DNA sequence: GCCAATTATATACTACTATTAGTACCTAGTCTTAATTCCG
DNA sequence: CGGAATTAAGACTAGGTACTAATAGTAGTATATAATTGGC
């Protein structure tokens, strides 16, 4: 009886899961919003959404020119700037998803994560492994900060790379870590 | 110029080369009707340009979770609450990398810190200090079996020692400052 | 038995009249473009344009919140800026309106009417009335010219103030006007 | 609170000081039926919203081309091509400012100038300079009769004098420098 | 001169676009007639 | 309890919105069957 979802609200809806299923058909969109394919149509149009066969293309487009490497994927955070093998800054937001559902609180793993990746895309050498981390976790890291962490090239020797990372939330140490990369020139 | 054989051979390298070539530019490239076409995508088991254009896009789509938004690492085997507890970890492609084939150093703490969170049986813990060593390589397709115990306990910490294996093997060892409260 | 507009070309047509005469009904337009009504609902849908009634509205409310004065529509030129009885300057751009056909330069009146529109402008007091003029226009302005009038008061008495007014094109003097403006406090 | 008489003075009164109210509006203002509003409104003889709406809308709406966007100024009535010509001009509530009804000075000097390109019987001419006087004040309604008469003629200039009347009252006075060319 | 290879031709498909048509409903009225209140 | 004032009820309108439905056409195929050419 009641369509709960009016024309402003389905558009928005439909948005979302074509962009969460670009592979989806308007015939699959019309079952999951009971509104004709016609609707579903003249949604897609107004919304500036190619249909089906041409998302595809743009999704394959994307992949074939190669855009976003290997490296971008595997990394935990956003890479902001680097200067390689000196300093180093990534920024991570915290969803629902690195929180403990209990407290809010990102569990330890996350910014460890984020700090390894981080000396991994700093290092720029052909082989880069860690060895060895000291971690501190300062303060309480909250649902819906964004952690600002920095690494830092501290010394070098001929087998080893000594880093340093200092992670921030609104300028407030909240993680400090101490990381022996293992670099070899082949 | 081109004999069925040598076209079709040709055909197949054009289509790798490029997926979002039409069988009409095809037609136009090999000066051969658009139906030898059809017949030779046939014979080479390449699918029509929308099959293939899916297949590029499905192939780089359906990515999983990176460990950051993942709760519990590894499969919990066993636990004996604030005493002994162990997790395996099955190392699959995406826990290694790419290049090397080696697990990347966040994976291995992952399952540890996880174990520590599981095997301290209190309201509220919380990670504080970690001090981690990679002994060996873990590469891809091996079985991380991790074991976690409680060395120390203070009335604020719990003090967790961790070592992984791989088969009868020591490739990760940490010792973990777990806080702890009663409220 | 072609229809010479395409979905787009025809839009813009739509657009373009529906902006010369917000007035105009769904019907009229179908009518005028020879395409069905819905093509036309559409069509201002995709434009974002709104119903005839909205539209009346717009241009009601405009008029009712006194936006734009009856003193800015009487002005020759766009006013771009005032200080009160010292300096003062307006924008005029040379439309085809504006030019001799034949030659394509600007007719006489045109720059003197921007000319004696600023000095009103400028003076502000109750009453301003133009009682003489002398002008001499120095180069020809041509169509597409953009004519920077920039009006100063040089003497004032107690019935009287003179202005000096010059216009330019791209940093070229092309008028020279001197204006005897009358003023009364009443 | 408000009988017939004083509720009609009082929806009259709110409908000027805000012609977008609608008749529901107007019902829980003055807490009467939505038919009595509709009453009211036809003895006041006030139009409904829609029509009251587009009145406003009407009204600062169309607009004729300002005195820069205009050709000939005026109506030629007599030429001489090179000796004497005279143009008229009904001064209408387009020409004349607003609040006080007084010819703007642009006005005029179009009129004259209009008549300086007119008379001269040349390809090509062009106003180079001009000396004018507003004697009197040129008002609402009033016809503005303007003639223009070649003074002087050298081999580059034409030398105009114009004198437009109103009655027989002079009320501007004009000395043109017209550049003519024979190509 | 045969058969394998190649082209022509005729049918259908999916997932659309662009356009036409048509329904129910909306606002803010109209115009009419009928019933029912306040107030003196 | 009367008539003037007020409200209620029913039937219509313009210029839409929002939605459903359906058609001709499209790309880039498919399936199958026939007819023709080219190569030894």
Chains 1, 3 share one sequence.
Do not use: W
């Amino acid at each position: 009886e009641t369509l709960k979802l009016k024309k402003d609200k389905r558009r928005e809806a439909i948005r979302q899961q074509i962009d969460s299923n670009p592979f989806i058909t308007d015939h699959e969109l019309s079952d999951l919003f009971q509104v004709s394919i016609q609707t579903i149509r003249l949604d897609r149009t107004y919304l500036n959404i190619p249909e089906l066969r041409k998302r595809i293309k743009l999704v394959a487009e994307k992949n074939y020119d190669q855009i976003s490497s290997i490296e971008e994927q595997e990394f935990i955070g956003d890479l902001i700037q680097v200067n390689p093998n000196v300093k180093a800054q990534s920024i991570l937001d915290i969803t629902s998803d690195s929180v403990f559902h209990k407290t809010g609180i990102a569990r330890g793993h996350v910014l460890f994560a984020q700090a390894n990746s981080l000396c991994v895309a700093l290092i720029k050498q052909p082989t880069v492994l860690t060895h060895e981390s000291s971690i501190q976790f300062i303060e309480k890291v909250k649902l819906n900060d964004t952690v600002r962490a920095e690494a830092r090239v501290v010394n070098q020797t001929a087998k080893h790379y000594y880093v340093e990372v200092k992670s921030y939330v609104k300028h407030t140490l909240v993680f400090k870590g101490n990381f022996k990369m293992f670099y070899d020139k082949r």
